[model samples]
Target: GPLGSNHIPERWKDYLPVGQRMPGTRFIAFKVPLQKSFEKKLAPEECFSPLDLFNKIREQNEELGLIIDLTYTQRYYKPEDLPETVPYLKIFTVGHQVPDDETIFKFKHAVNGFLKENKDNDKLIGVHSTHGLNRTGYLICRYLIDVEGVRPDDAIELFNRCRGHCLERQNYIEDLQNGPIRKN
Candidate 1:
């Protein structure tokens, strides 16, 4: 099988259904923390537990405020399992796919709301999908360009550099470059 040596435990295989782990899981900004999905029971030994990650983030000068999960399926701990200090929001977008305009709109609003409410605080918004590559990359780039008024190319390049993975989906790249949708 393609998963030979890297084969995760059967219970944990769903953690990365595509059979590969994402590289360079880190925060792209002081406010946005992006990474691969964290399944309490299935997370590999090589990775940090959600609590450990949050503690580390706090130690690094930012408070972990929210975890926005974008995975289409739930194979890990329930929302109630999240630490009391951090809130959880699940957007439920399918893996390896782009979200519809409605979903994107909601995402943008959610991010904007978070930013507005915590503008003065050093808080981080945690985002994740299966491998935290395409889907995660797409939305964060979209947020940068749409809400922050960053140039599309600059947004893409910045996310790629920060996340350590190129945005491999052409559709996503094109969407960001085309600019945000505006309605009267």
Candidate 2:
């Protein structure tokens, strides 16, 4: 497999800072898990408390916008359960990886659309998983750097800085080093 270059690890710590002050257009994508007790007999209220975090960020910046989730492997929280912190916050679901090219293409398209829709208005796409690294890290790095023109070298640095050891496992490291597997 071709592991793309790691580019810049030094700036990972400062990438978010740059994003905070990004002048014209800036899009922040996150790959986050739905909720710890996602599937159970519990009610929707028992799911994760995304509202709290969303509110905190909203407080920081009144312009804070949408939340695009790209974890398509399984069903987590329902659309209704999504928090209503930001007035314009929207939730989008995407597909995960698979054994065929069609699925990968579909995944890419969903990601592209997610970015396109929320790429405006200083929107921050929060990508988080049960574990902050691995799949979450891979998707976010690819979207920000490869698609959004965020310097690849700078993407790695920002990722690590935002979450320590973004790629701690071998598979994650491989994904991080190399971009997603896109087939024609």
Candidate 3:
């Protein structure tokens, strides 16, 4: 309501898979959840709001520990709309560009906080940008390669395979391939 994310995200229909948890990692990637403000433009079948997201996760039999928002604005949905049981973090990453060290570090910090506290259960950290493909893919793969010691190629492919959408940005991909990795 406050800004441009009020309308449906462009290419929203292209990203059909609601939520997919990366195997062996406490990560699940999905499109940004819209508020009721978007419902008018979206058909019921096309609408994917905050509650819809939670239900989809439950359909997958997964427990969400936290949600890391990468979209540039908070207009899409509020943290209050999410279940109180799950914590929320917003890093405000600009789309079509790789997230900087500070943003990545904040992500690492939030993830580490959850991991440290939820060591007993395999709860997941949900991540999303607009379409949940490029920015989302980049960060998840970057974390796997940088913090988890996964090979760049393997991490990228694993993310694509799990998220059900191959990453589309060449810049992000190149950096993930040849660019220096970040240390947490």
Candidate 4:
């Protein structure tokens, strides 16, 4: 039931207030991109297509290698629509909520795998949920703490600084503050 067919895209329009970032961090977070049909519902000036956004990201940072999408629903657009130059990872988790340990583990592994393969290079991993705040922040913060050995408080602070105080959820913050189960 959580993964409904017609999930509301407009509800997340104000989430994360798109086009914000702190480039060069191995992890970059942002809101989900809208489909052309969904884009048509909004004014032209208000619209920023997925390709456009990714293009801008690539333009600004050439090292960007992967995009990890964390939205539960795919009503917006397909991953194939994204540029083939970079790979995409879709991990369909519900928006506006914290993911379970298994989901978090998977997310961390995906990120770690990418980073491990690109360890010698500066490869950026772009992640997004509906708003790019809670879910994105939680997972990214998890990775920072679990892998980078960053203090939880410092990781949260860094995420807020980079993506705008998107992690407004107390539970998610607490989870990050508590830390994750790290293998190494």
What RMSD does each model have against the real structure?
7.7, 11.1, 2.0, 3.7
Give the candidate number with the greatest TM-score: 3
lDDT of 3 by residue, 1-184 (tens): 5555566767977786465788889999999888888888877888888888889899999978899989875488878777556888888888466789898888888888999999999989999988888888888888888888899889889888887788999999999999887878
Candidate 2 lDDT tens digits, 1-184: 8643322222222222112212323344323323434325334543334554455456657344544454444554444666665322222333333213453344455556655776554565454443445455555555555456666546666766655454444554455456553542
lDDT of 3 at 107: 82
lDDT for 107 in candidate 1 is 72
Q: Which ranges of candidate 2 are over 4 A from the true structure?
A: 1-48, 62-65, 70-76, 85-108, 118-120, 148-153, 178-184
Worst 10 residues of 1 by lDDT: 17-26
- TM-score, model 2 to reference: 0.53
Which model scores highest in lDDT? 3
Better of 1 and 2 by TM-score: 1
Tens digits of lDDT, candidate 4, 101-130 = 778888988887897889898778888888
Q: Determine which window of 10 residues in candidate 3 has minimal summed lDDT.
A: 1-10
Q: Which stretches of candidate 3 lie over 4 Å from their true place?
A: 1-5
Q: Residue 102 lDDT in model 1?
A: 69
TM-score of each: 0.70, 0.53, 0.93, 0.83
lDDT of 1 at 96: 47
By lDDT: ranked, best first = 3, 4, 1, 2
Every candidate's lDDT: 0.57, 0.45, 0.85, 0.73
For model 4, the superposed segments whose C-alpha errors exceed 4 Å read: 1-11, 15-24, 95-97, 179-184
Better of 2 and 4 by lDDT: 4
